Amino acid sequence: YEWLNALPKAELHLHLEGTLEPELLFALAERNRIALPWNDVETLRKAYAFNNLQEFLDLYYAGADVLRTEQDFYDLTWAYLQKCKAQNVVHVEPFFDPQTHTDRGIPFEVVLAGIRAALRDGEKLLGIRHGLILSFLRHLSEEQAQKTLDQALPFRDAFIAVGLDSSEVGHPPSKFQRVFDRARSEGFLTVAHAGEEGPPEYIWEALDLLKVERIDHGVRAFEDERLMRRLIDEQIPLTVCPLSNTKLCVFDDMSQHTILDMLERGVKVTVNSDDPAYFGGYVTENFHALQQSLGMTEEQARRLAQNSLDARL
Ligand code: HPA
Numbered sequence: 001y002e003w004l005n006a007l008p009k010a011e012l013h014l015h016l017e018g019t020l021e022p023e024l025l026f027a028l029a030e031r032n033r034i035a036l037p038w039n040d041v042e043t044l045r046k047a048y049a050f051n052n053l054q055e056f057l058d059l060y061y062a063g064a065d066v067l068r069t070e071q072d073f074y075d076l077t078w079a080y081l082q083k084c085k086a087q088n089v090v091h092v093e094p095f096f097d098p099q100t101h102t103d104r105g106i107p108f109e110v111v112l113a114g115i116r117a118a119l120r121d122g123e124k125l126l127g128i129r130h131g132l133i134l135s136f137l138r139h140l141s142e143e144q145a146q147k148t149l150d151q152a153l154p155f156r157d158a159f160i161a162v163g164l165d166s167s168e169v170g171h172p173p174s175k176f177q178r179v180f181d182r183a184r185s186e187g188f189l190t191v192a193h194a195g196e197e198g199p200p201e202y203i204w205e206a207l208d209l210l211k212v213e214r215i216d217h218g219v220r221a222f223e224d225e226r227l228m229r230r231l232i233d234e235q236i237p238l239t240v241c242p243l244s245n246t247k248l249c250v251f252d253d254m255s256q257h258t259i260l261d262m263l264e265r266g267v268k269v270t271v272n273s274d275d276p277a278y279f280g281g282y283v284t285e286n287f288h289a290l291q292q293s294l295g296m297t298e299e300q301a302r303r304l305a306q307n308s309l310d311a312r313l
């Protein structure tokens with residue numbers, strides 16, 4: 001663990017909203033004078049049992065209620081950056097879901113201000129390079145995403161890319177082809193969630209329609225040999241999230257996970273925590289799980305860590 005924790009890493013698949021520790025949620029609710037449904041930290045913490053992606057999302061979005069002021073968004077981001085320092089993550093390219101907040105009345109400028117301020121401290125104080133990624137909510141309409149992109153334009157230099165998260169199944173990448181087209185035209189790089197719960201086809205769509213630079217999750221690509229051969233050949237990065245896949249039942253067990261298999265075949269896989277506050281582990285806890293349940297070696301450890309550095313945008 002300590003050896004794993006000492007490795008220099010880059011986290012390329014992480015939702016800032018998914019770093020909302022139960023404790024923080026309660027503290028922010030207190031500061032905002034919000035009455036929580038949950039009786040105590042422990043009660044919220046045991047609500048963290050998921051049968052699938054959606055059950056997690058429902059709670060995930062619920063917690064986002066406490067995020068209301070700039071200082072809120074700073075605290076959220078700064079807390080995570082401190083974890084990064086602790087676990088020697090030297091570079092971050094995090095997600096956030098502006099719609100989750102803007103649809104709640106919180107000004108776009110307020111959300112960005114808080115996060116940006118934290119990112120600034122992260123680099124000058126902690127020496128952590130950042131690349132903010134704006135993610136669209138895929139269960140919502142492409143029109144709603146277009147309206148979000150319009151908000152983002154004056155801010156565009158604050159984002160290295162646009163992403164796509166939320167309920168995958170039934171909301172294929174193609175649904176957002178237009179806004180992604182416009183995003184790139186406006187100077188955004190692109191990434192996307194594909195093949196978490198969705199089929200290999202969704203991954204092809206991400207690659208060819210949304211023209212992403214990397215696939216987020218992408219584990220279901222294992223079902224498609226033709227796709228696998230492309231991945232290996234094009235060295236397109238995959239931001240794999242071990243604990244997330246386990247907690248969401250993508251794999252019935254960590255021993256079932258295919259990330260090492262992919263690694264040995266030549267796929268540019270990386271290790272990420274995704275939604276750490278919800279899956280009970282940050283990036284180091286993810287590396288560790290691979291070691292305990294898959295007998296991962298230091299050898300493959302150095303390699304995964306390196307890929308994450310290489311796959312920086
Ligand atoms: O990992 C994820 N998958 C889909 N939607 C999400 N919203 C936060 N994390 C995720």
Ligand SMILES: [Zn+2]
Nearest residue numbers: 013015165274
């Ligand atoms: Zn994710």
